[PDB]
């Protein structure tokens, strides 16, 4: 099938090429695909290297025995307003509604499906031991009530849901800047209902606002500072009190980023880049199918090669072949523990902050004594931890509360569970747990570090034969134990929860990732850092791309967009023919 | 005065000695002091090296203009049951009550004083917007009430204070182990009041219990596991619910460690006696570091090399006939490297300091010394930040607050009302945060470039105050701390702006932490003796607070150094130290 893309765990000592791409994630794969498809180099002269035994980086889809559908260890969904990932998956143009009348860009067949949001009638919000339905705030407001909670909000914020309060905070901040309220008042909209705030601000509008927006609150410790220079927890507490911050931080799930990051960058991240008709979708064959579709398109050019289980150690300008090649790269061939040299004229580091820090810091590129600016910009983002646990049950116990799909949210350390689906033949049913924020990394770490692993157990269409293949990826007994205990407290006593037969634990804080996703720090010029990272030194053909230093952090689109900007800026490529000239990219 | 201990910022290329001590913190200073006082080596053959421009490491006392008394940036107090730091400060024996009838161990004069605890009638607990007095739980229980709070406790725990609930948790866990309830039931005591739990477990009893204690709770995810293998947040939630954990985590400040660290190690850390009190040193707590440094330095040839940073060390060098090890130092004043030759290396330095050394040498090499690397990572680096703030008057006295500290779930977490100059009335507050993600709340503010501007006050000229320009907190941090201090105390007291601040971030290199905490699942009884000499064929030792069993204390640093000294440097117990003070296995 399409996910058997060949991977070379071998080596070719003294390989000579033009472009070394390090990282077979979304950005690396897309760089390789674009360079060869546009004939900028022959396939043999553009090679990808990865230390992993798979392509896709933070996309990793899995089929667990007994359950014939894809679980997601990493990314799961896209937005149709994200035009690179959307066009590459669905084909062009995006104006055609008939998928049959669309021209595919990539050969691999990918079945787009809507991403289940579920029923807010049946999905749980479990905060300070109070079990609400997610529609509790809506239901209350229809009866003209202000829903009481065990958070002590400011009086003027009482009855607001988390969504409504964020919308209010962002409205209040934008409209206190005279220049913003005047220049964009049209697209910053107070409705008639006290809880009704909407935004029509485009990605390009946000690019105008973010660097200029001033925090205009006369008694605030943060008065007259760029909102850029204010952490998001700082700003949310200043606006709705620390009890307000506890409500918003605890009542948001994976998508909702309430760490103390760049408030200016946080605003668009929370209200969107305007919308109508855009929905969340995934790929029936698993979301990592998009990585395999780009890899396979690159690999259909003979000479193309993904080197797997090959780890970049270091690179230097001081080597025997400076007549043909500016750079010598050293790789560790993990299978053999043998080092080998590669010669290249361009290096693309398609890899996140932690991956950059794990490279030899003593070389000409990273040297702190020389490149203090590089090192400051590498540290311009927060490494956010993310963990995923997939759990297979003999039946979907959640259906007893009328839950089909979607996710429950709680201030318990588990934070979130997605009811991910039921094999209609075996009835075997998948849950995924997603935690990491509000110190929950430290709650779970002790349990995930324990040595005694969960034992697989036979179930419908899942033999011990098949399940012992996943022995080494099982969650720990203590983690499964405590997650079962928290799932019982979350759902309540009315529903029996059986033990799972199979688990799959993934820790994205593991090297070389060191993070699920990244978040701009307060006080950095993001408009200046991004173009800098795409080529840090004026006299070196070394580029950084991927999600970490994108302005769409937490998304494949971020990784594709930084690669695309890098390609137009330094590799002489035009916008792809399949990409609308009106999709907004950046300054260039 | 006693704090002008000479420091050599220079270098001596190819210096040849026996024992290189890296770190002029409490453990390094005490190693040097013990080796020369017991004449194990001549003072020229035992040298201390530090990258800082002062000795004392995580002890740093300061006098700020306008206020004639010592502020503490780092450690502030000791317990009289901590027998090394207590004897070194006060002299021997510890049974004598008259300080005049005591024999000093060190020449420097140090004035012991009680550490002000304050009045729980007047000190604040501000949790989820409810302002209690710290005695609210006691007062309620006297009127036979169960004090209500905005934490939703299990019903069987309602009305308990944070102290009472911890005591209950620890009682319940110990008594569920048949072997413990039977072997130590005598010293694990339920009173008649529902809230009354006390302990008489000694350090030696805890060393017996910690490695064996089993968690006996049949429906628990953690049932039949060593308590050693359970994180403390894990254990507290299993015992009093996640809302119970929120209560205990938020209502502790004062040396209350509720991170997800080793539960077995956490138990003694929480219940601790009688007659033992908290004390400080009137001349500032770093005086104990200066007293040990000065005692070492009164031996001819003794030297603290300051602003000299260890980079690396190797067995592959030109002088292996006289010296097993060549050390390379960065002379920070010149940015030049120089070699030192030695037969023993003592790394008197915490986890982050070890990690900042050249990891590629024979010692740290991960490909060979995987157990060293695992054990270096056996402890959590707990962040700590301190902000001293000088006010023209003690605004806190208006609420009848003399002294002690208020606690809150606001990000500021804790303020100590540290004292008032009786002549100028200038009054010092210290803010202490870092836990419960408060590191990330404050970091954005502390990293901002625009610094708080000093302002003249009684007996504090701009002349004197501009000397501290570069250590002022940021305007944003002072701004937000003032905002949180007003919400903490309430509207009944006006709080003026400070005239001076002093910001200290202990997460800065090379410290990387205020203090350390054993992780769950490590054999601490086996890691400690390992860290004091990791490789059987190398004379390289680690000592200090980080891998002690009294983390967060000078006593931990002294005790690991003392064990290291008796184990590998052929020293006897000091004559001034009681043979009955329990040290470890050896
Ligand atoms: C839990 C989770 C949920 C997510 N949800 C979504 C979502 O719903 N939708 C979405 O669009 N995005 C989502 N994302 C992001 C998505 O996973 C993207 O792939 C991600 O944004 C990163 O792609 P990238 O090119 O930056 O590289 P990465 O995926 O970070 O790839 C980096 C690669 O570099 C390799 N590498 C690093 N160092 C070296 C070295 N020295 N030598 C060799 N190889 C090296 C690594 O092995 C890896 O393969 C999610 C991420 C996570 C973790
Ligand atoms: C906020 C705070 C409050 C505290 N409160 C108390 C308290 O009230 N009472 C109490 O008893 N204890 C307290 N402690 C602990 C106390 O400060 C002790 O000093 C501490 O426990 C550690 O002493 P140490 O020997 O481990 O070394 P450290 O104090 O960590 O000294 C290490 C030294 O090594 C040096 N160094 C590191 N790397 C290198 C290198 N490569 N080359 C050269 N030099 C290097 C550093 O410059 C430093 O001087 C507190 C700690 C903090 C942070």
Author numbering:
A (entry chain A): 0 to 587
B (entry chain B): 0 to 271, 274 to 587
Per the authors:
In this study, the crystal structure for the ligand-free form of AncLLysO (AncLLysO(LF)) was determined at a 2.4-Å resolution. The initial phase was determined using the iodide single anomalous dispersion (SAD) method. The active site structure of AncLLysO(LF) indicated that residues that would form interactions with the main-chain L-Lys are present including R76, G553, and W554. On the other hand, there is no space to bind L-Lys at the site as the side chain Y254 occupies the space, inferring that dynamic conformational changes of Y254 would be induced as the reaction progressed. In the ligand-free form, a cavity at the active site to recognize substrates is occupied by the side-chain Y254, which is the residue forming the plug loop; this occupation would bring about structural changes of the substrate recognition residues, such as E383 and Y516 and made it difficult to predict the recognition mechanism solely from the structure of the AncLLysO ligand-free form. Structural comparison between AncLLysO(LF)- (green) and the L-Lys-binding form of AncLLysO(K387A; magenta) are shown in Figure 5D, suggesting that dynamic structural changes could be confirmed at the following residues: 251 to 254, 383, and 516. From a structural comparison between the ligand-free form and the L-Lys- or L-Arg-binding form of AncLLysO, substrate binding appeared to induce a conformational change of a loop that is formed by residues 251 to 254 (251-GGYY-254); cis–trans transformation at G251 is remarkable in this change.
Progenitor sequence of the assigned 28 sequences was generated by ancestral sequence reconstruction, and the generated sequence exhibited L-lysine oxidase activity; thus, we named the enzyme AncLLysO. Taken together, we assigned a novel FAD-dependent enzyme, called LLysO and bearing a main L-Lys α-oxidase and promiscuous monooxygenase activity, from the database. The main-chain amino group of L-Lys is deprotonated by an activated solvent water molecule, and the hydride on the main-chain carbon atom is transferred to FAD.
